[PDB]
Design an enzyme around this catalytic site. Structure first.
Site, PDB file in Angstrom:
ATOM      1  N   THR A   1       4.258  -5.253   3.607  1.00 28.74           N
ATOM      2  CA  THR A   1       2.838  -4.908   3.593  1.00 28.74           C
ATOM      3  C   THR A   1       2.546  -3.664   2.761  1.00 28.74           C
ATOM      4  OG1 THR A   1       2.895  -3.577   5.621  1.00 28.74           O
ATOM      5  CG2 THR A   1       2.509  -5.954   5.860  1.00 28.74           C
ATOM      6  N   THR A   2       3.565  -3.163   2.075  1.00 30.30           N
ATOM      7  CA  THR A   2       3.394  -2.015   1.193  1.00 30.30           C
ATOM      8  C   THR A   2       4.040  -2.398  -0.130  1.00 30.30           C
ATOM      9  OG1 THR A   2       5.511  -1.035   1.878  1.00 30.30           O
ATOM     10  CG2 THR A   2       3.517  -0.287   3.022  1.00 30.30           C
TER      11      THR A   2
ATOM     12  N   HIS B   1       3.818   7.947   2.974  1.00 40.22           N
ATOM     13  CA  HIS B   1       3.054   6.743   3.306  1.00 40.22           C
ATOM     14  C   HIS B   1       3.144   6.466   4.807  1.00 40.22           C
ATOM     15  CE1 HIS B   1       4.368   5.917  -1.009  1.00 40.22           C
ATOM     16  NE2 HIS B   1       3.057   6.065  -1.076  1.00 40.22           N
TER      17      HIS B   1
ATOM     18  N   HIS C   1       7.175  -1.570  12.979  1.00 42.98           N
ATOM     19  CA  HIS C   1       7.898  -2.530  12.165  1.00 42.98           C
ATOM     20  C   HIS C   1       9.374  -2.168  12.106  1.00 42.98           C
ATOM     21  CE1 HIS C   1       4.050  -3.689   9.724  1.00 42.98           C
ATOM     22  NE2 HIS C   1       4.108  -4.277  10.906  1.00 42.98           N
TER      23      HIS C   1
END
Ligand SMILES: [Zn+2]
Length: 258
Positions: free
Chosen positions: A196-197, A62, A117
């Site tokens: 956010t995932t 990812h 991040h």
């Protein structure tokens, strides 16, 4: 068969497996610089990364992560809107297929080439797994990347990406100093959000820096050479691994600064 950023398993599909995707405090969001409120009560951020101990870098299919030893308060974040000490556990990026997109948060609808991040967890909870179950469990530092001059401190990361091109690959990555990824100014916005995932838990207190760092086109280009797929499978370039902005709803974004 699971979540991703494709047309059939992308962000618009996440709610089916993770209902919280339609929650009240989802991230990212658009930062509307004129409606954000300056809060004189906000303290300056305190970033103590002098004793940071990086361990490994891996491609989880990812994005790629750079993991740190979080067994002690070696690299911590304090101050700002936070109450307590937060330990750095990992950092990763989200980027686009073109320089005009890639960031998750936007500023007055402006999109950056990528977003860094730096994930920290509240030590009061003992471990990362317990922290994600709390409303004040995580504190993520978000930094925007714009294309321009190269960032010397990022080159070490760029040079090892060839070794973790496909999903599942990992490599030793010791003695990396995250301080080389920080901008000059620490002025920030902050708001309560989520990861956010998937699994998209609403346990984050977001601290997004106003000042972007610059990276060269060559550096970002190497990010785009990674693969979502595993070795021995059809090649799918790892690009556009960002989630679009979500509804702010009943939330207020605060600013440390002018
Ligand atoms: Zn992220």
């Amino acid at each position: 068969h699971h979540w991703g950023y494709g047309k059939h398993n992308g962000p618009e599909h996440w709610h089916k497996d993770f209902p919280i995707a339609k929650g009240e405090r989802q991230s990212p969001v658009d930062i509307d610089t004129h409606t954000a409120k300056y809060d004189p009560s906000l303290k300056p951020l305190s970033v103590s990364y002098d004793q940071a101990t990086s361990l490994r870098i891996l491609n989880n299919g990812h994005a790629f992560l750079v993991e740190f030893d979080d067994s002690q308060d070696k690299a911590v974040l304090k101050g700002g809107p936070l109450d307590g000490t937060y330990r750095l556990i990992q950092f990763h990026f989200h980027w686009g297929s073109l320089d005009g997109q890639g960031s998750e948060h936007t500023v007055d609808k402006k999109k950056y080439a990528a977003e860094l991040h730096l994930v920290h967890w509240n030590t009061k909870y003992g471990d990362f797994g317990k922290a994600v179950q709390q409303p004040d469990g995580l504190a993520v530092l978000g930094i925007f990347l714009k294309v321009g001059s190269a960032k010397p401190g990022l080159q070490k990361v760029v040079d090892v990406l060839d070794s973790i091109k496909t999903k599942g690959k990992s490599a030793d990555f010791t003695n990396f100093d995250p301080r080389g990824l920080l901008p000059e100014s620490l002025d920030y916005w902050t708001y309560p959000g989520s990861l956010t995932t998937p699994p998209l838990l609403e346990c984050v207190t977001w601290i997004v820096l106003k000042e972007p760092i610059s990276v060269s086109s060559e550096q970002v280009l190497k990010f785009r050479k990674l693969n979502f797929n595993g070795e021995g499978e059809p090649e799918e370039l790892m690009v556009d691994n960002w989630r679009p902005a979500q509804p702010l709803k009943n939330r207020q974004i605060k600013a440390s600064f002018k």
